[PDB]
Design an enzyme around this catalytic site. Structure first.
Site, PDB file in Angstrom:
ATOM      1  CB  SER A 117      44.878  55.679  11.709  1.00 18.80           C
ATOM      2  OG  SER A 117      46.022  55.030  11.157  1.00 18.80           O
ATOM      3  CG  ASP A 229      50.139  59.262   6.776  1.00 14.29           C
ATOM      4  OD1 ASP A 229      50.767  58.399   7.426  1.00 14.29           O
ATOM      5  OD2 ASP A 229      48.938  59.505   6.923  1.00 14.29           O
ATOM      6  CG  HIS A 259      49.062  58.630  10.541  1.00  7.08           C
ATOM      7  ND1 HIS A 259      48.293  58.259   9.468  1.00  7.08           N
ATOM      8  CD2 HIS A 259      48.705  57.830  11.566  1.00  7.08           C
ATOM      9  CE1 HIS A 259      47.458  57.314   9.837  1.00  7.08           C
ATOM     10  NE2 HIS A 259      47.690  57.026  11.127  1.00  7.08           N
TER      11      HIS A 259
HETATM   12  O1  LIG Z   1      46.983  59.421  17.077  1.00  2.00           O
HETATM   13  C1  LIG Z   1      47.479  58.360  16.708  1.00  2.00           C
HETATM   14  C2  LIG Z   1      48.290  57.443  17.603  1.00  2.00           C
HETATM   15  C3  LIG Z   1      48.220  56.146  16.845  1.00  2.00           C
HETATM   16  C4  LIG Z   1      47.966  56.489  15.370  1.00  2.00           C
HETATM   17  C5  LIG Z   1      47.053  55.480  14.640  1.00  2.00           C
HETATM   18  C6  LIG Z   1      47.800  54.213  14.307  1.00  2.00           C
HETATM   19  C7  LIG Z   1      46.965  53.332  13.410  1.00  2.00           C
HETATM   20  O2  LIG Z   1      45.768  53.115  13.547  1.00  2.00           O
HETATM   21  N1  LIG Z   1      47.646  52.708  12.463  1.00  2.00           N
HETATM   22  C8  LIG Z   1      48.999  53.079  12.125  1.00  2.00           C
HETATM   23  C9  LIG Z   1      49.751  51.848  11.709  1.00  2.00           C
HETATM   24  C10 LIG Z   1      49.028  51.061  10.619  1.00  2.00           C
HETATM   25  C11 LIG Z   1      49.767  49.701  10.451  1.00  2.00           C
HETATM   26  O3  LIG Z   1      49.167  49.088   9.307  1.00  2.00           O
HETATM   27  C12 LIG Z   1      49.650  47.816   9.163  1.00  2.00           C
HETATM   28  C13 LIG Z   1      50.692  47.355   9.926  1.00  2.00           C
HETATM   29  C14 LIG Z   1      51.110  46.056   9.717  1.00  2.00           C
HETATM   30  C15 LIG Z   1      50.515  45.235   8.784  1.00  2.00           C
HETATM   31  F1  LIG Z   1      50.952  43.982   8.621  1.00  2.00           F
HETATM   32  C16 LIG Z   1      49.477  45.692   8.013  1.00  2.00           C
HETATM   33  C17 LIG Z   1      49.069  46.986   8.229  1.00  2.00           C
HETATM   34 CL1  LIG Z   1      47.787  47.544   7.276  1.00  2.00          CL
HETATM   35  C18 LIG Z   1      47.623  50.705  11.060  1.00  2.00           C
HETATM   36  C19 LIG Z   1      46.865  51.877  11.585  1.00  2.00           C
HETATM   37  N2  LIG Z   1      47.369  57.796  15.447  1.00  2.00           N
END
Ligand SMILES: O=C1CC[C@@H](CCC(=O)N2CCC(COc3ccc(F)cc3Cl)CC2)N1
Ligand SMILES: [Cl-]
Length: 285
Positions: A117, A229, A259
């Site tokens: 992520s 996802d 995800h």
């Molecule tokens: O094991 C695990 C537990 C946690 C998970 C990882 C979560 C992680 O890193 N995320 C998921 C959410 C994603 C939100 O993205 C945005 C949100 C608002 C915005 F305004 C612009 C963007 Cl781009 C960013 C990355 N995996």
């Protein structure tokens, strides 16, 4: 008074480093016995921490790789306001510091990145900043990409109060494995707070920067992505396979999967573990 983690444990008791901003980062190492074949930094995602890579990290160490990691600023056992950062580049800067340290102590060795992520976004930007240096990159549903006015609206009141939040990361769309959604909702090192506008903007900078970096990547990579996802859209993995100039790039798609592929239904997770294992073995052997 000794400097303490946000969970009040003294850093003289834990593996740690101090970043360029004077902040303490919690560090985590899994060293094989005898001499290592390569180095690999594990880069965790948003809200989470290095501790969630226990299983993957143990499997990589078992191929005789020296696996290292740290909690990004404002995560886990590291310092900083939770899930906030002055610029997304701090994360990349901090990975490079840790990598440069490890390389000093184990010269000769190839160094790999694994990121999930947001940690995948950090992995990409890290490789793009030292073109040709990284031996390989293992990307688990990296952040590569949600409306136009919600974008335009953010930076408007990023001036006023940027400590307003949207919803928390919705935990039901993390994994079809309910045991792992339970584990996520239970981990006191995981921040399950709302997404602060100021952090939302940095994630948007990251997306923007990653997209400018894609056409420039040459590093070998393995890219694993679920088709269902709701957090990082599958289209992002297709786009990374299209734009990356890497002569050695592989996509594996897990149909129906959410995800967190390394914490999914076991048919998926066992596959994820096996593919990472074969791809790293073939490129260290
Ligand atoms: O094991 C695990 C537990 C946690 C998970 C990882 C979560 C992680 O890193 N995320 C998921 C959410 C994603 C939100 O993205 C945005 C949100 C608002 C915005 F305004 C612009 C963007 Cl781009 C960013 C990355 N995996
Ligand atoms: Cl950056």
């Amino acid at each position: 008074s000794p400097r303490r983690t946000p969970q009040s444990i003294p850093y003289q008791d834990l593996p740690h480093l101090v970043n360029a901003d004077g902040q303490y980062l919690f560090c985590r190492y899994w060293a094989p016995t005898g001499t290592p074949k390569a180095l690999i930094f594990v880069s965790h995602g948003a809200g989470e921490h290095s501790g969630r890579y226990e299983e993957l990290a143990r499997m990589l160490m078992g191929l005789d790789l020296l696996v290292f990691a740290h909690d990004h600023v404002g995560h886990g056992q590291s310092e900083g306001e939770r899930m906030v950062v002055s610029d997304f580049h701090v994360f990349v800067r901090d990975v490079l510091q840790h990598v440069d340290s490890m390389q000093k102590d184990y010269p000769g060795l190839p160094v790999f990145l694994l990121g999930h992520s947001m940690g995948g976004a950090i992995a990409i930007l890290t490789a793009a900043e030292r073109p040709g240096h990284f031996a390989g990159m293992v990307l688990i549903s990296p952040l590569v990409l949600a409306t136009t006015f919600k974008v335009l609206a953010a930076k408007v009141l990023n001036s006023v109060l940027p400590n307003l939040s949207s919803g928390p990361i919705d935990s039901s769309v993390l994994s079809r494995n309910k045991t792992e959604v339970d584990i996520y909702n239970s981990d006191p090192l995981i921040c399950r707070a709302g997404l602060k506008v100021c952090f939302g903007i940095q994630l948007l900078n990251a997306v923007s920067r990653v997209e400018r970096a894609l056409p420039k990547l040459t590093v070998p990579f393995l890219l694993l992505q679920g088709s269902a996802d709701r957090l990082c859209d599958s289209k992002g993995a297709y786009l990374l396979m299209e734009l990356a100039k890497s002569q050695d790039k592989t996509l594996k798609i897990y149909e129906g999967a959410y995800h967190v592929l390394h914490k999914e239904l076991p048919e998926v997770t066992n596959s994820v573990f096996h593919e990472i294992n074969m791809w790293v073995s073939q490129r260290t052997a």
